[PDB]
């Protein structure tokens, strides 16, 4: 219709533009996607970005002297708003240039082809609600297990599963498997859906909801995942890839068990791992309620540390990748970890320590407990 003319609050505009730009493409092949769309209507400014795979949108309060749409460089706009003085922000489109005035600062940017800009994807209907902080936490706890190799794109994603009031996130890189479970609220508990979302895109998409708020997830069926919170809307294109059946990988019973303090164990693993060849292997020896960490060789230097542990079962000597180990430990978010071994050549179950592990006298075979989060790390062959 007409050229946009609007006055906005600095922090509102800088926040909106900042979050929206976080999703911008690094180097798009269609330069239009490198832009941010500003749409002024009635009493609101709609900032948005979209790259055919990820979408970010948000409406902020505004003083719309005149309505209109305009497409500007997202990079430059973000860098400008980031340095704008804490002053009212006037925006005025004129011809092929946009005027961004902030007190004494006066910027003039070139406009981009608004017509060539594609429409944002319509979010599906609300499928369920989750607390923003908890949702982000779960995504984080499982992301550590996801692969990072684009040649294997099926490992690069997070398996999101919905069945009634329960949600299950999973991720594996063929050597570790993280599975988190959490409750969520849904007005239609009959839904049973299972999607795969790129891990990184899912974490950055979780950023859509700030701590202290709620997030509404809307799953479509081309399929995409929508996230809504505090007026911010986000969409992530689903990853087309089959996810491994992970439930049978998890062991049913443990021949050995251990309970250690997460912090002290992490500190010790990081100490002893200094001498391992490129942080490749670390040896654990359990016996008589004492863990004996050892790593290295006589050619490079050896390290060894002894920590008191609550160990039960037949004594065990098993090796792990110190990195994968510390990665799992960092996600337990509990005071104490409980390990669950079978053989030195089979998976081990890292999980938060429960009440029943403290008093686990006997020799097993112990049954696999139930927990909201499990980190299943595959061990390394011992010389």
């Amino acid at each position: 219709l007409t050229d946009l003319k609007v006055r906005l609050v600095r922090d509102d505009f800088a926040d909106a533009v900042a979050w929206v730009a976080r999703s911008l493409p690094s180097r798009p092949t269609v330069p239009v996607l490198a832009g941010v769309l500003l749409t002024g209507s009635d009493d609101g400014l709609t900032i948005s970005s979209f790259d055919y795979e990820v979408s970010a949108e948000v409406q902020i309060p505004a003083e719309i002297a005149a309505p209109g749409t305009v497409l500007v460089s997202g990079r430059l706009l973000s860098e400008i708003t980031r340095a704008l003085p804490n002053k009212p922000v006037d925006l005025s489109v004129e011809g092929t240039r946009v005027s961004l005035t902030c007190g004494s600062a006066r910027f003039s940017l070139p406009t981009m082809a608004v017509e060539d800009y594609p429409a944002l994807p319509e979010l599906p209907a609300e499928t369920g609600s989750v607390p923003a902080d908890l949702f982000a936490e779960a995504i984080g706890q499982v992301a550590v297990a996801a692969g990072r190799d684009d040649t294997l794109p099926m490992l690069t994603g997070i398996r999101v599963e919905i069945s009634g009031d329960r949600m299950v996130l999973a991720a594996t890189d063929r050597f570790r498997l993280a599975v988190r479970e959490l409750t969520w609220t849904t007005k239609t508990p009959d839904v049973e859906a299972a999607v795969l979302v790129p891990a990184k895109t899912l974490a950055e998409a979780a950023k859509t909801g700030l701590d202290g708020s709620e997030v509404q997830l809307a799953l479509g069926a081309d399929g995409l995942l929508g996230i809504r919170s505090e007026g911010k809307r986000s969409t992530t294109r689903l990853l087309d890839a089959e996810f491994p059946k992970f439930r049978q990988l998890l062991p049913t019973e443990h021949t050995a068990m251990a309970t250690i303090g997460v912090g002290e164990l992490t500190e010790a693993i990081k100490r002893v791992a200094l001498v391992a060849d490129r942080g490749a292997q670390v040896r654990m020896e359990f016996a008589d309620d004492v863990l004996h960490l050892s790593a290295g060789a006589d050619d490079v230097g050896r390290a060894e540390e002894d920590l008191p542990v609550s160990f039960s079962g037949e004594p065990l000597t098993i090796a792990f990748n110190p990195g994968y180990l510390t990665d799992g430990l960092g996600a337990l978010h509990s005071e104490r970890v409980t390990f669950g071994f079978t053989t030195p050549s089979k998976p081990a179950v890292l999980r938060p320590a429960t009440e029943a592990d403290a008093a686990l006298n006997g020799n097993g075979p112990f049954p696999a407990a139930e927990t909201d989060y499990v980190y299943l790390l595959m061990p390394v062959r011992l010389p």
């Binding site: 594996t172 063929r174 050597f175 050549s345 595959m378 061990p379 062959r381």
Partner: peptide, 6 residues
Amino acid sequence: QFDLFG
């Protein structure tokens, strides 16, 4: 390094 899948 052993593989989880088999």
